[PDB]
Design a protein around this nucleic acid. Structure first.
Ligand SMILES: [Mg+2]
Ligand SMILES: [Zn+2]
Lengths: 126, 23, 136, 37, 176, 133, 192
RNA sequence: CGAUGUCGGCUCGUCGCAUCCUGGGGCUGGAGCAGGUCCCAAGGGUUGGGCUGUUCGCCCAUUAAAGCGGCACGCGAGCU
RNA sequence: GCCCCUAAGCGUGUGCUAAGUGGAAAAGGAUGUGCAGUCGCGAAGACAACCAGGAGGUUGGCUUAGAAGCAGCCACCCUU
């Protein structure tokens, strides 16, 4: 990868975050691309599922007050934006995690706030 | 040819300056 | 197996191995070439072997030039003969090669097999040689 | 064990090392095992 | 270098000392000493560790740095935890058992081959085909392991002989 | 855990299915009869089957859609593919057949939209050397 | 199109001759001579490393500006003497040029693209010469060989040129020749 | 050239290893028996006859094997 | 030429060699080492190791007994 390609990635993630009301960070450890294809089927209809460099999303997060999510990037990070609504991705992710036992709900982001696993599950319960 | 080789290489001394009779 | 059609004089003094080459020192028809780093008479059997080796490693495509032609004859006396009684009879054809001379020339699409064929040819020659290319 | 003036890494698993002042080629394939001598 | 710059941590249950170049470590499993190369300086990190330092940068010092660090780590591990290695025997009619402290093998020879137990090494056979070699020193454990392993010539056809725990030998086919 | 492509109308083949099915403990006859019943209901083309195995030796057959290459062959009307793809063209396909096969690959595939399967089948036709029009 | 001249420092030779030139080359310098329409040959010595860097970066016909004891002089590399074995530079002929002067210089021709898989591309003329303004000599000329079938000849007149450059050598000079790939059997009788 | 006796055989050896046997190994298109090839190794051993002046060679019986060479093609003030 | 034999320096300063190279040798083979110079990537985390993946289409077609990403020829694509 090059610096220009990396910067294009930063701009793309920045615009994707600007285009989404919420974002949820989870874990994809021990997942097969078949499972990822199923998740993409179940999400891309309404949501958007992405993965990138943790540091590159750190550079994409310096735009708005989302620098507080850097602590949640320790380990693999899967980015799920919500272009339609804000909770369908959270519910689908939680069901996928319960089904595969391989996805650990790292965190979320709501109303300009970074929440814990329990808070995100409560919000999904709302 | 060890004998001839030894003589012809002995030509290469510092005192002989790289030349000797019968080379 | 290259032999001149005719020569004006069949028996000649040996070619001189003095100095370095002044003509044919750059690659001109192909993309890569073989350059000599020593003085040596190079016979037509050696040229044949090197040409065959390059052709074998290059297979279908590519074109090969031989800028060196063995037109200088060497003679040898019949065996078990004392000295004297005239000069021998011509039975080798060689070409005098000075350092800086570009011997063979290759034009092939890919660099790896181009250089590999050139090395295969070099291993059949009696000289130290290197591979050169058009760019300075 | 092949003992020749020339030793080379026949395959992609061959490693060239130097033991006790001798150049050797060591491979998981015993055929490819060779030393310089 | 990169190995030489990572200090070894020292658990609480092991006693260490530095007497010039010599170094001795006492632990639950026993006492083991070491003497290190002259250019290399060994110390005691006050935070409960050992720091190795090469004052120069030449090849000899750069090589001894990593070697010294790894030997020190092995030294602390040997007394803290101990080393053990297991073997399995393959082939029909091949067995093993303890004749007291010694090891007795049945490898097809006209006589049974007995393997003596050197100092600091203790065997423990659990199955007539599976046993283990344990000890406090990694070098001695590896040596006795190799000597036991070479008791039969390699057999690429049937595989009969002594193997390590997870070793995958090479095999071929004799059609005739 | 093996997969195969096999003719619909006949069971117990010699080359492909026999030995591979055998070395997996699958009952040959019951699979043959069930596959023959399903493929006589189908009666379109040959069908690919995936073999899934269990510890109780029970066998489950996975029957997918007719092969895309075979569907393109029937749509182009030719039997054997072009020996020099992109260098000699044996037949031409209009977008109706390509889109029918695209719907087939949508039903059998992960594609979100029929356009993805249409371009997949266009790539298949490129691989065969068959023009898509 | 314009090329910024490359800055170089040159010192007048105190002593000229074979031994003096050998000494200067031993100190990593390159002797050279400067002449031109002014009719006044000046004998100089240039640093080998920076001169080699300039030539490597901007081809074999590079515009230079020479600081000779504070005087700035524009020059163009007319010719280079290279030892065939050591491939160093032994001598350089620098031509005095001013702005708005037409010169006739070789320019290398390189080919790019990919022709038919069943064809072999042969380049007959490594370099061609053109008439161009001294400050706007093109670094190189390029001929694209794509979609070229069987025996097709690309000559000098068919070479695209920048604006303000004139091709002086005749257009019939064959530069690139595309031919059918020689068969495996056709390589066994050429050269015997 | 005011003389350095010449081929085979006998007798007596002595040295090299480029090893024939015995000894130690690596890779095998090494299942075993038996091999093939390469590396190490000179301690000892390395047969008797038919034909030929013969060296050499072919052959007959064996043997673990029936090694290759240098020493004025070792050795005639030792023999023929 | 200058440690002792053997007259005069186990001379001074700055580096190199680990081969007794010095104190014999070729084509060629080689992660020996010192110096000088180019090009690639890299804290927006490079290389090595490690963990998790590395699919579906589809076994792409010709071709055979066979062709399944890997006897052989061709193009050599699409989604996530
Ligand atoms: Mg050569
Ligand atoms: Zn190998």
């Amino acid at each position: 990868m090059a610096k220009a390609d990396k910067a294009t990635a930063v701009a793309d993630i920045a615009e994707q975050f600007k285009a989404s009301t919420a974002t949820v960070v989870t874990e994809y450890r021990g997942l097969t691309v078949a499972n990822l294809a199923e998740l993409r089927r179940a999400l891309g209809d309404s949501a958007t599922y992405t993965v990138a460099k943790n540091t590159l999303v750190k550079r994409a997060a310096s735009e708005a007050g989302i620098e507080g999510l850097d602590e949640l990037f320790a380990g693999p990070t899967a980015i799920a934006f919500v272009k339609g609504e804000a909770v369908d991705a959270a519910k689908a992710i939680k069901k996928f995690a319960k089904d595969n036992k391989a996805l650990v709900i790292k965190g979320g982001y709501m109303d300009g706030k970074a929440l814990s696993v329990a808070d995100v599950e409560k919000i999904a319960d709302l | 040819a060890k004998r001839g080789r030894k003589k012809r290489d002995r030509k290469h001394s510092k005192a002989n300056h790289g030349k000797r009779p019968n080379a | 197996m290259l032999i001149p059609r005719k020569v004006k004089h069949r028996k000649q003094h040996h070619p001189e191995q003095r100095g370095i080459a002044s003509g044919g020192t750059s690659v001109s028809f192909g993309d890569y070439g073989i350059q000599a780093l020593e003085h040596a008479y190079i016979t037509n059997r050696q040229i044949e072997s090197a040409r065959i080796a390059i052709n074998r490693h290059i297979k279908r495509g590519g074109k090969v030039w031989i800028n060196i032609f063995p037109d200088r004859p060497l003679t040898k006396k019949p065996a078990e003969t004392r000295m004297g009684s005239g000069k021998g009879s011509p039975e080798w054809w060689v070409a005098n090669v000075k350092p800086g001379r570009v011997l063979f020339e290759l034009s092939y699409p890919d660099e790896k097999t181009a250089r590999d064929a050139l090395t295969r040819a070099i291993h059949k020659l009696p000289i130290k040689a290197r591979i050169v290319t058009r760019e300075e | 064990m092949k003992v020749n003036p020339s030793v080379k890494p026949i395959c992609d698993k061959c490693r060239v090392i130097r033991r006790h002042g001798r150049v050797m080629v060591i491979c998981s394939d015993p055929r490819h095992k060779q030393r310089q001598g | 270098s990169r190995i030489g710059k990572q200090p070894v941590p020292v658990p609480s249950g092991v006693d260490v000392t530095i007497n010039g170049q010599n170094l001795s470590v006492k632990g639950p499993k026993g006492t083991l000493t070491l003497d290190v190369a002259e250019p290399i300086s060994v110390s005691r990190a006050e935070d409960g560790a050992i720091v190795v330092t090469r004052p120069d940068d030449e090849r000899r010092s750069r090589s001894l740095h990593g070697l010294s660090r790894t030997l020190i780590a092995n030294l602390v591990t040997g007394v803290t935890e101990g080393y053990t290695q297991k073997m399995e025997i393959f082939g029909v009619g091949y067995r093993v058992q303890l004749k007291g402290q010694n090891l007795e093998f049945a490898l097809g020879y006209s006589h049974p081959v007995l393997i003596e137990a050197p100092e600091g090494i203790t065997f423990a056979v659990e199955s007539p085909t599976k046993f283990s070699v344990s000890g406090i020193d990694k070098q001695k454990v590896g040596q006795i392991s190799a000597v036991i392993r070479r008791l039969r010539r390699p057999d690429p056809y049937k595989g009969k002989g002594v193997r390590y725990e997870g070793e995958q030998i090479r095999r071929k086919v004799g059609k005739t | 855990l093996i997969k195969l492509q096999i003719q619909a109308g006949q069971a117990n083949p010699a080359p492909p299915v026999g030995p591979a099915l055998g070395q997996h403990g699958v009952n040959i006859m019951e699979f043959c009869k069930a596959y023959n019943a399903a493929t006589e209901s189908q009666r379109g083309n040959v069908i690919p089957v995936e073999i899934t195995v269990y510890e109780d030796r029970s066998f489950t057959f996975a029957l997918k859609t007719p092969p895309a290459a075979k569907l393109l062959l029937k749509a182009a009307g030719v039997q054997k593919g072009s020996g020099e793809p992109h260098k000699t063209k044996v037949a031409k396909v209009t977008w109706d057949q390509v889109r029918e096969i695209a719907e087939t690959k949508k039903a059998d595939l992960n594609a979100n939209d029929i356009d993805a399967a249409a371009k997949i089948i266009a790539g298949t036709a490129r691989s065969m050397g068959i023009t898509v029009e | 199109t314009a090329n910024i001249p490359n800055k170089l420092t040159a010192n007048v030779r105190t002593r000229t001759g074979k031994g003096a030139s050998r000494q200067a080359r031993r100190d990593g310098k390159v002797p050279a001579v400067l002449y031109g329409h002014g009719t006044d040959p000046q004998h100089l010595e240039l640093n080998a490393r920076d001169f080699a860097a300039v030539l490597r970066s901007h081809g074999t016909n590079a515009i230079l500006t020479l600081d000779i004891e504070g005087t700035e002089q524009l020059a163009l590399t007319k010719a280079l003497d290279v030892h065939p074995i050591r491939r160093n530079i032994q001598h350089a002929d620098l031509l005095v040029v001013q702005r708005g002067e037409k010169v006739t210089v070789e320019v290398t021709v390189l080919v790019e693209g990919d022709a038919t898989p069943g064809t072999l591309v042969t380049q007959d003329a490594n370099t061609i010469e053109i008439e161009a303004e001294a400050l706007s000599i093109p670094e190189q000329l390029t001929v694209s060989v794509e979609g070229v079938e069987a025996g097709t000849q690309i000559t000098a007149g068919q070479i695209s040129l920048p604006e303000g450059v004139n091709l002086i050598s005749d257009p019939e000079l064959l530069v690139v020749n595309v031919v059918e790939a020689p068969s495996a059997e056709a390589l066994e009788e050429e050269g015997a």
